[PDB]
Amino acid sequence: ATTLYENKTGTEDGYDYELWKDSGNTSMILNGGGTFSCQWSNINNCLFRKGKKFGGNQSYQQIGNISFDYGCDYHPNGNSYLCVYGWTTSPLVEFYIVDSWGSWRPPGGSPKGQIYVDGGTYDVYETTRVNQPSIQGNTTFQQYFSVRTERRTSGTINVTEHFKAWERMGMRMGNIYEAALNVEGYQSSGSANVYKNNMTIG
């Protein structure tokens, strides 16, 4: 219904959305609810997402179950990934549950372990980003990744279950800040239609 071509944040039907790129061509069609369609080309970095911020300072147990029931028509022509994306605070962690990717499988390096969630096996990774932009300014924070061992582009992502598995692997879970269904592109072109994105909370 509404198409965005330039960096913007906002809300639609209760969902926080963002289009961002540092340079290049981007189009994000806001299609209601959690749904959005995007196209990129000639970009360095871009992202497209719809999700929800939680507010306050509450743990995943306090919030209740967080899940995404999603479907994406996913056609990256180069580097890209399709994931649930979000942040915790106390401690500050940028987290990723990646179900598909383009030419490169993120994040690199070697996994801490593997977990089994929503019928799929996920490699688990932890990294540190030093003095990088974040939801709390330029600072140092951890990244948590679950990355599916084989690509898929529709199904349920039970975010809470990844949180619990990460905890069991020793990765500390603080208060949940936001979670969103997210398409990233890097030095590439592509399209991705998130035609279904039902976020459920509790």
Author numbering: 29 to 230
Paper text:
Instead, individual domains and domain combinations were investigated structurally and for possible interdomain interactions. Xyl exemplifies a “beads-on-a-string” protein where the individual domains are “beads” each connected by a linker (string), with each domain retaining its individual function- making the synthesis of novel super enzymes for rapid and efficient degradation of bio-waste to biofuels within reach.
This is a result of the low symmetry space group and a non-ideal crystal orientation, yet still reveals most critical structural details. Two symmetrically independent Xyl-GH11 domains occupy the asymmetric unit. Each Xyl-GH11 adopts a β-jelly-roll fold composed of 14 β-strands, one α-helix and mostly short loops of up to five residues. The domain resembles a partially closed right hand with the β-sheets forming palm and fingers while an extended loop between β-strands 8 and 9 forms the thumb. The substrate-binding cleft of Xyl-GH11 lies within the inner β-sheet cleft. Comparing Xyl-GH11 to related enzymes including the Trichoderma reesei enzyme Xyn11 (TrXyn11), identify Glu122 and Glu212 as catalytic nucleophile and general acid, respectively. The latter adopts “up” and “down” conformations as part of its catalytic cycle.
